[PDB]
Amino acid sequence: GALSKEILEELQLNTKFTEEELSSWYQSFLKECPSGRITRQEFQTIYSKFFPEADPKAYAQHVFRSFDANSDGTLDFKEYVIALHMTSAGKTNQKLEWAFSLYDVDGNGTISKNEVLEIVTAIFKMISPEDTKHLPEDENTPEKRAEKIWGFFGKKDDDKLTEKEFIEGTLANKEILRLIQFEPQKVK
Ligand SMILES: [Ca+2]
């Protein structure tokens, strides 16, 4: 097929390849995935291959789920391309609403204390133990990282974090941005 003028428009406001190039990638994608769909197991394998120093299965599953809040089924080429952009390219502040969808594990519209710990833990496993030693003491375990996040938002244990407030805080408080950071290369 051809990449629809519509998906190209979709992709080019959310990422950066070009129209023709995304078609080129698409034609190759179709050769390898004839149905134009990729399963969660297939998507996980991409992360397994390219993060040999890490244990990225949980992270990849959460990233996959951010495009349905469902684990079964598939992604299409558009979601697959956007997923790779989110994890690996561009600047974080252009990604804040997607970050919210990542952290809202159950997709119920708000973020809970446990959901922060789940995603923080998954991201934490993307970092080698070599790199883990260079992290500051008060931010070197998933529990410390996740509790610092929850405290930066002024939250009690049973509170619910809205998208409005998540965007505000990730924009304003650069310590929050550092702690919620989901691109493995940027978790320094
Ligand atoms: Ca939730």
Side-chain angles (χ1 to χ4, degrees):
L3 265 202
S4 97
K5 272 25 140 290
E6 288 121 12
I7 51 79
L8 294 157
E9 292 157 351
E10 182 89 13
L11 269 355
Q12 292 178 260
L13 211 129
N14 297 273
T15 85
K16 178 136 290 138
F17 272 74
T18 88
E19 248 198 89
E20 179 189 319
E21 305 179 347
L22 278 157
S23 283
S24 188
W25 189 357
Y26 181 62
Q27 287 300 333
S28 186
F29 180 87
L30 280 185
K31 294 290 172 53
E32 303 295 292
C33 311
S35 67
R37 313 292 307 215
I38 185 172
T39 66
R40 184 184 97 261
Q41 300 225 332
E42 300 171 333
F43 187 81
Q44 288 165 210
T45 300
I46 300 170
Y47 285 78
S48 184
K49 270 172 61 61
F50 297 121
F51 292 91
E53 304 186 57
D55 291 274
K57 224 175 94 299
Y59 176 85
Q61 182 146 8
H62 287 300
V63 168
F64 177 100
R65 181 267 308 149
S66 74
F67 294 98
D68 15 355
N70 163 31
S71 93
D72 198 325
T74 65
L75 303 185
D76 63 13
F77 177 74
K78 179 182 76 67
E79 302 172 327
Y80 149 95
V81 170
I82 301 179
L84 288 167
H85 281 93
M86 295 302 179
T87 64
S88 296
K91 330 249 246 289
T92 306
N93 350 74
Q94 295 183 223
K95 294 168 187 186
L96 295 179
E97 115 288 356
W98 178 81
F100 181 85
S101 66
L102 176 77
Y103 276 90
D104 185 10
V105 184
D106 68 4
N108 76 338
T110 51
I111 300 172
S112 73
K113 188 173 176 110
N114 289 343
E115 286 176 328
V116 174
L117 178 62
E118 188 167 3
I119 301 297
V120 166
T121 303
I123 294 166
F124 190 83
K125 285 183 200 178
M126 298 299 290
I127 304 161
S128 76
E130 291 96 354
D131 296 79
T132 313
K133 286 137 73 176
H134 298 159
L135 300 170
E137 181 281 321
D138 71 317
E139 310 174 352
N140 71 0
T141 77
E143 299 83 355
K144 295 161 176 181
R145 285 175 85 78
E147 293 163 16
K148 274 188 67 155
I149 286 154
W150 205 240
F152 270 128
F153 279 112
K155 294 290 171 290
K156 320 203 288 299
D157 282 5
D158 267 38
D159 285 26
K160 299 110 188 171
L161 178 59
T162 60
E163 189 172 9
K164 169 192 186 281
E165 194 193 333
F166 175 92
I167 292 181
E168 290 173 0
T170 55
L171 278 178
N173 192 337
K174 308 307 173 187
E175 302 191 69
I176 293 183
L177 196 47
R178 188 180 67 247
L179 285 174
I180 61 99
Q181 179 58 267
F182 43 87
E183 311 189 31
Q185 184 63 30
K186 288 176 188 167
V187 199
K188 38 64 203 251

